[PDB]
């Protein structure tokens, strides 16, 4: 009864995220005047969010509406690994976008000598390698012995894998994003003083607020409930803070191409 209702609003979110993240890629794959490192830092974020909304998220919706895992155990292992990998790569794409914008507004003339076509490629390599190191954590060593029932798909919640990956996958990128965007905000107030602090404060506030509002509930419920045995939350709040991190990948195409005038001229041209 309510399974079709929850499934159709979930599939609406899936189609919205897939269409948005394929529009961000199509804005660059056809418009050849977008060829810089700043545009590739949005392209790889759209690639990570498209892999999540295309390959991971239909199986998350099926797992939510059915109640059990209707595929094999190797498909469950692949799905959990690709889930952690694509979400971690999305968060680190946000982090490297933030670093690029900081050393773009702090060194405007010395930007093509400090962000070259080789160091941005190496930054993509080093964020995707660390996402892949975190996601293939429990695949050989970081796993307590799971039950052998094929119709369950349990995520890994080891204390020590949750804490380390939570730290190095949210709390260091959160601190970096906050530092670089507060310095960007300080520069954007000319380092009419009312119409300048309001616009930059609103623009950076929605950018950092969507990120924290989608990912801080998950990364606050997950390490705290894995360490303090007194705090055990409900099972509705876990699904809510689980799906908010999925919602971030559908929120991201509305924000980051609309924070670029060339992308704003290409996005409405490709749709």
């Amino acid at each position, epitope marked *: 009864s309510k399974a079709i209702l929850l499934g159709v609003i979930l599939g609406g979110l899936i189609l919205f995220g897939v269409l948005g993240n394929i529009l961000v890629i199509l804005s660059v794959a056809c418009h050849r005047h977008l060829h810089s490192v700043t545009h590739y830092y949005i392209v790889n974020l759209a690639v990570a969010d498209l892999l999540l909304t295309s390959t991971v998220l239909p199986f998350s919706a099926i797992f939510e509406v059915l109640g059990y895992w209707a595929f094999g155990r190797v498909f469950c292992n692949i799905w959990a690994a690709v889930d952690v990998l694509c979400c971690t790569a999305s968060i680190m794409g946000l982090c490297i976008i933030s670093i690029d914008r900081y050393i773009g507004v702090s060194y405007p003339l010395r930007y093509p000598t400090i962000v070259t076509q080789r160091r941005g490629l190496m930054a993509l390599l080093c964020v995707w390698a660390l996402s892949l190191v975190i996601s293939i954590g429990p695949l050989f060593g970081w796993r307590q012995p799971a039950p052998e029932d094929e119709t369950i798909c349990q995520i890994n*919640e080891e204390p020590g894998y949750v804490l380390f990956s939570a730290l190095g996958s949210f709390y260091l990128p959160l601190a970096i994003i906050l530092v670089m965007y507060c310095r960007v905000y300080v520069v954007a107030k000319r380092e009419l003083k009312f119409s300048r602090e309001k616009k930059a404060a609103k623009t950076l506030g929605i950018v950092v607020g969507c990120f924290v509002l989608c990912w801080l509930p998950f990364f606050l419920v997950m390490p705290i409930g894995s360490f303090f045995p007194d705090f055990k939350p409900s099972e509705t709040v876990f699904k809510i803070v689980f799906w908010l991190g999925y919602l971030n990948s559908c929120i991201n195409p509305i924000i980051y191409p609309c924070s670029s005038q060339e992308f704003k001229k290409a996005f409405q041209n490709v749709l």
Partner: nanobody, 116 residues
């Protein structure tokens, strides 16, 4: 905390019948599965049966002749094993695992022997 304590096992002739039980001494949520697994001396743990709210699952070697049942009021799970072949001689554990979170309580174990 939940301490699954299973019983009911013993010594069965070939083709006989047994009825395993697993109690809880606590509370398992209704959105959790509860199953029976089996480990032979020499091999590893294999899944045998499981009942939750979303499905009832069996292993394909015990699919026709085993029957899992659950009483959520007394928080107990029964496994009626009929027509016992001489390869079910193993240790049977009961588990109270979850579907999507790394939560698994495990029983002590009960030896079930089939001979001929």
């Amino acid at each position: 905390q939940v301490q699954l304590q299973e019983s009911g096992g013993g010594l069965v002739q070939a083709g006989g019948s047994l009825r395993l039980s697993c109690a809880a001494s606590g509370n398992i949520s209704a959105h959790w599965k509860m199953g029976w697994y089996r480990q032979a001396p020499g091999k590893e743990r294999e899944f045998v049966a499981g009942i939750g709210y979303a499905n009832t699952n069996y292993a394909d070697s015990v699919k026709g002749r085993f029957t899992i049942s659950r009483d959520n009021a007394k928080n107990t799970v029964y496994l009626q094993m009929n027509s016992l072949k001489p390869e079910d001689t193993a240790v049977y554990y009961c588990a109270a695992y979850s579907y999507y979170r790394d939560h698994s309580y495990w029983g002590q174990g009960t030896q079930v022997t089939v001979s001929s």
